[PDB]
Design a protein around this ligand. Sequence first.
Ligand SMILES: NC(=O)c1ccc[n+]([C@@H]2O[C@H](COP(=O)([O-])OP(=O)(O)OC[C@H]3O[C@@H](n4cnc5c(N)ncnc54)[C@H](OP(=O)(O)O)[C@@H]3O)[C@@H](O)[C@H]2O)c1
Ligand SMILES: NC(=O)c1ccc[n+]([C@@H]2O[C@H](COP(=O)([O-])OP(=O)(O)OC[C@H]3O[C@@H](n4cnc5c(N)ncnc54)[C@H](OP(=O)(O)O)[C@@H]3O)[C@@H](O)[C@H]2O)c1
Ligand SMILES: NC(=O)c1ccc[n+]([C@@H]2O[C@H](COP(=O)([O-])OP(=O)(O)OC[C@H]3O[C@@H](n4cnc5c(N)ncnc54)[C@H](OP(=O)(O)O)[C@@H]3O)[C@@H](O)[C@H]2O)c1
Ligand SMILES: NC(=O)c1ccc[n+]([C@@H]2O[C@H](COP(=O)([O-])OP(=O)(O)OC[C@H]3O[C@@H](n4cnc5c(N)ncnc54)[C@H](OP(=O)(O)O)[C@@H]3O)[C@@H](O)[C@H]2O)c1
Ligand SMILES: Cc1ccc(-c2ccc3nc(N)nc(N)c3c2)cc1
Ligand SMILES: Cc1ccc(-c2ccc3nc(N)nc(N)c3c2)cc1
Ligand SMILES: Cc1ccc(-c2ccc3nc(N)nc(N)c3c2)cc1
Ligand SMILES: Cc1ccc(-c2ccc3nc(N)nc(N)c3c2)cc1
Lengths: 249, 249, 249, 248
Amino acid sequence: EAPAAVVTGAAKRIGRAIAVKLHQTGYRVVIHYHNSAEAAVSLADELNKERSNTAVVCQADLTNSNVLPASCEEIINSCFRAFGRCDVLVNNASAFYPTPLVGKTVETQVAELIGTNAIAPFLLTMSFAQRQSNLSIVNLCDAMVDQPCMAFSLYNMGKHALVGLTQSAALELAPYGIRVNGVAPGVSLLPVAMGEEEKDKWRRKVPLGRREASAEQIADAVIFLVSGSAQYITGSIIKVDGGLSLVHA
Amino acid sequence: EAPAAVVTGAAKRIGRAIAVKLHQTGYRVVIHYHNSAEAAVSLADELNKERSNTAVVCQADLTNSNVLPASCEEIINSCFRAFGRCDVLVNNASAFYPTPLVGKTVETQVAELIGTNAIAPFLLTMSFAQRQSNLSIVNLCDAMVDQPCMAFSLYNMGKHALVGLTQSAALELAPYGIRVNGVAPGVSLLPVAMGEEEKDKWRRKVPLGRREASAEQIADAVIFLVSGSAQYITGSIIKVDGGLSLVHA
Amino acid sequence: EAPAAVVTGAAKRIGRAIAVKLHQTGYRVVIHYHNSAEAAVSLADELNKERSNTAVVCQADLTNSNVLPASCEEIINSCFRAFGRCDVLVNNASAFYPTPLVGKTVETQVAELIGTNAIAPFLLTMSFAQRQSNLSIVNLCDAMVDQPCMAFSLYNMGKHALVGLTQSAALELAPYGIRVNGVAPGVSLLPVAMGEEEKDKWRRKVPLGRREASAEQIADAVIFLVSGSAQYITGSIIKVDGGLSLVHA
Amino acid sequence: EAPAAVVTGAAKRIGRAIAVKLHQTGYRVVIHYHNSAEAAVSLADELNKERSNTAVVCQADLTNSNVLPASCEEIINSCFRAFGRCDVLVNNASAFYPTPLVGKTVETQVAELIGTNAIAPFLLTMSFAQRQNLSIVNLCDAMVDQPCMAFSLYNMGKHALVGLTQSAALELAPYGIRVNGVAPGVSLLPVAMGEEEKDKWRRKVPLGRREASAEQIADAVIFLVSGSAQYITGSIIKVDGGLSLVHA
Ligand SMILES: NC(=O)c1ccc[n+]([C@@H]2O[C@H](COP(=O)([O-])OP(=O)(O)OC[C@H]3O[C@@H](n4cnc5c(N)ncnc54)[C@H](OP(=O)(O)O)[C@@H]3O)[C@@H](O)[C@H]2O)c1
Ligand SMILES: NC(=O)c1ccc[n+]([C@@H]2O[C@H](COP(=O)([O-])OP(=O)(O)OC[C@H]3O[C@@H](n4cnc5c(N)ncnc54)[C@H](OP(=O)(O)O)[C@@H]3O)[C@@H](O)[C@H]2O)c1
Ligand SMILES: NC(=O)c1ccc[n+]([C@@H]2O[C@H](COP(=O)([O-])OP(=O)(O)OC[C@H]3O[C@@H](n4cnc5c(N)ncnc54)[C@H](OP(=O)(O)O)[C@@H]3O)[C@@H](O)[C@H]2O)c1
Ligand SMILES: NC(=O)c1ccc[n+]([C@@H]2O[C@H](COP(=O)([O-])OP(=O)(O)OC[C@H]3O[C@@H](n4cnc5c(N)ncnc54)[C@H](OP(=O)(O)O)[C@@H]3O)[C@@H](O)[C@H]2O)c1
Ligand SMILES: Cc1ccc(-c2ccc3nc(N)nc(N)c3c2)cc1
Ligand SMILES: Cc1ccc(-c2ccc3nc(N)nc(N)c3c2)cc1
Ligand SMILES: Cc1ccc(-c2ccc3nc(N)nc(N)c3c2)cc1
Ligand SMILES: Cc1ccc(-c2ccc3nc(N)nc(N)c3c2)cc1
């Protein structure tokens, strides 16, 4: 029968492309969302039109809190509930915004940026492993972590922690046959609130084609890592950045 | 005027070694502690008998919470209260224990391991910089972050986030003339509860001398980074590991 | 028209598996070899029986010398002579043997280890680019490059230069639409001369499955990197090591 | 008696500052050079004026060839002949020029860039070790993962040097020989480069919008050879003003 995958923040943009490609590959999917209910259900409707009862949605805030472990457990449980199995976890949901060192309170920013990018991946990783073939986890990382955007220290700390989790969980879960890997975009789908001139500044920086990655190109790397063609691969983070991280200042 | 330094978790072990060496170099010191009140007071007494009014203690829990920003702000405030300046911050205090993926609640484990190793350094860094010559911050990292101990994922995530901080904060605070660097021990002071046979198993693995780093050897690298001999150094992490991280399985 | 690929050191082992999978994928192939003449011709025979006129052999020594540039030129030329095009270069051929610091002269050891692992890849890369779809190069690197085997300094130097080449050529050849990537094995096909107790000692070290990578599992990663599913990927090295590089001493 | 150090390419620029600082720390020095005889001799005279019989020059081409192993052995031998001991080796000499992928022949560019940056350090390390606070410091490059366009052989040479630093650290540790690296970002700029282009680069550096002095590079070499770094091996210290942290 068909394997099942959980994709966090799967309603729009990159998580959406990932869930679509996984479904096209033959997976049943849990579309996790926080604020984007309409979009999440729209995607489920589309996927279920293709193959009946192969997509469900699951709401959760992934901000760090007292209830986050229970929320993460429920995300995994919804996959087992809907499909009787959970073969793939994709940690894609992510808050992204500046937190200058020199109005959300700083402790809220910690909760959101560190929660979404690191603690929730950790808790979902725990629950995914506890509840257990070709099982794997794919973490959406960031190819630019060592050359970070100015004033994004919390966001960067979140993504660095996710690298640590990817590595630690690969080592620890290997005995269980659970592989744990990452995909590290450089520039992909650009901010909605970014202006067109600024977009082109960034595009011009990419050696391979002077363009951002499509969400589908990011999804392609996820598809590889979950597949039978990556069965010896664990603890690896694959850059999908058109060479951007190689470009000096 | 003598410069002043804050060392977190400075009552014993490596934090103490760093405070002492800074003091011997001519720094006035804030000895931060959490539980080790007797040892912190004792160390301060010792340093003050060497030079009068050159050391004060400062108690704070560095577990993550909504009050952690205020606590970190107060730690920096206490350096200015005592000495009228704050030249150096050393982020040494650190929780370290296993958190298996498959007692304390996971919420507490997250708060302690991520708070001490990452969030408190980030908040102390904000406060140190907000309050502002040879200014710098040294973060105590871990040379083994890419070959972590089994079942230490939250601890590892915390140390990886600290690397991210070191880099982000080096970039962002360079315009202010604040350098931000790391020292990464491999095996130094062994756990107090560890049996001699287990200690020797680890000692035997170290290429350079088959022994752990002394606390002073760790302090030596910290003292270099804060000195005028490191005035162009920022965003660097110096391994003090005797070659351990180079040794394959 | 079918695309064409050069695989160096393709007569046996991992190189052979790569040549076989490329061919199965629809590529015409140049089977480069040095001494394994019989095995190279035998492979070409096998592949040509499957689809006629889709495989040729090409002999060359890839040791560093003044004629190495011309030899590398001729390898690329042989691909054009046979197939009219050259879409993919796989830098697989590699000398591997200890060279302690404390019958071959050191001059020969340098020429062999640095020539095969670094200079030949570099010269092949020049020639490939100069003769110029989905064009790409895949370099066979080494996951253990930062945790090297004792007394393998020249080999390790070679593999390190190979990473540098992958990055530098990714950046420079991007404007030409040539992607440059790496696949980094941990332990795969074991040395011929190695005895069985020693083989099993190394197998025990691999977290994922306690065994070495098949040559086909290595080839699988090469296949991905050259595919249309990796079209935004350049300057990336994918570890295929079962988590081995994550294991501390 | 005083310890002794060999510094390669020590006649000028960064290697010169390294030799001067080592000398000021109390080392006797072998000032190796290739083409800069007048500058090397001028340095030796300055140092010997300071302390009699504490500096000698040693000429050698560090390009890769059949004779390079013998030349490197002779450089180490020179330190023993002058001073009776060799405590420190600094691998500083380096060829640096573009080699685009698309009058020197490429085999000569390989020989010069790979020989000076990698093979010569390896042979020198062998010779240094066969003869034995002992340490080796290799001059690396902080920008090796964000390389300059069309510098592939140079970049290959420096990556090879990181491999050597790690491999030799591991292998010579049982002998009490530590092996480390100093990785400048931008330090002393080419003499020929117009100020307009120098300042373009200077402005990229987060920490003070300037290049490293040769003396600041030397300071990190001085730390690594000192008693203060006695547990440090296989480490490479960036001295780059934050440059490698700056995205495109
Ligand atoms: N886009 C890029 O150029 C780029 C570059 C580097 C790395 N990446 C990584 O790739 C991944 C996807 O990128 P993206 O641009 O598609 O992401 P995105 O648009 O910024 O966000 C993806 C989703 O994250 C979910 N999310 C945010 N905060 C949440 C919270 N507190 N709780 C639960 N869910 C939350 C949101 O779901 P709802 O809409 O349902 O609220 C959002 O739609 C991220 O991990 C990102 O860091 C992207
Ligand atoms: N020891 C090693 O071999 C080694 C290896 C790698 C890295 N390191 C790094 O080097 C640094 C020092 O090592 P160490 O072994 O000396 O450290 P440690 O003894 O394990 O901890 C140092 C201090 O951290 C403080 N701390 C713990 N939890 C705290 C909390 N919730 N709030 C405030 N303070 C808290 C404690 O202060 P109180 O005693 O006052 O409660 C403790 O004395 C650490 O950052 C460590 O990660 C050490
Ligand atoms: N566990 C592993 O096997 C492992 C681990 C890490 C990395 N890797 C990397 O993966 C690749 C394949 O591994 P492998 O074990 O299959 O390699 P290998 O069998 O040791 O060597 C591959 C071929 O390289 C060719 N070669 C050697 N010296 C040459 C020279 N001077 N000139 C021209 N060709 C020469 C030989 O060709 P002829 O037989 O025709 O003479 C040989 O068959 C290598 O790059 C290796 O470094 C392998
Ligand atoms: N300058 C920078 O911004 C920078 C940046 C990153 C890394 N670094 C590293 O720091 C080190 C010092 O840099 P630098 O700018 O001072 O170096 P440099 O001036 O470019 O070269 C130093 C010396 O290397 C010697 N050399 C060149 N080719 C040689 C050969 N074939 N055989 C023997 N010696 C040869 C030359 O000696 P003669 O003059 O006697 O012929 C030259 O003076 C180098 O390893 C370099 O890669 C420097
Ligand atoms: C030029 C440029 C391209 C893409 C983004 C960008 C947009 C959204 C976004 N979301 C996120 N959770 N994480 C990111 N790293 C991210 C990055 C920003 C700037
Ligand atoms: C063999 C061995 C050597 C040293 C430690 C060790 C002891 C205490 C300790 N505290 C800490 N905050 N962080 C560490 N990384 C740490 C590590 C553990 C095991
Ligand atoms: C345990 C163990 C597994 C595999 C090899 C091994 C065998 C052949 C081999 N060839 C080569 N060109 N490069 C390597 N790194 C290599 C490695 C050595 C030791
Ligand atoms: C802008 C700019 C910055 C630094 C150099 C520079 C000058 C000389 C130089 N020599 C050398 N052996 N290695 C280098 N990496 C180097 C670099 C050149 C141009």
